[PDB]
């Protein structure tokens, strides 16, 4: 849904904030979807806790 990439929104530690919105994959003609977004695995996911610190939350 995203640079026909390959969903492109499961990077928690990339901080995919979207403010201004992805706004590309307009080009759309080819069916077949990459098979390479078959491993979304890819995801730290340990940034969230330490970026929450809000400082002295």
């Known amino acids: 849904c995203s640079k026909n990439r390959k969903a492109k ?4 530690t990339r901080g995919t904030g979207a403010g201004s919105r992805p706004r590309g994959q307009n080009k759309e003609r080819p069916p077949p979807v990459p098979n390479p977004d078959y491993e979304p695995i890819r995801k730290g ?5 330490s970026g929450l610190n809000q400082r002295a939350v």
């Open 9 to 12: 929104a499961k990077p928690v």
């Open 45 to 49: 996911q340990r940034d969230l806790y």
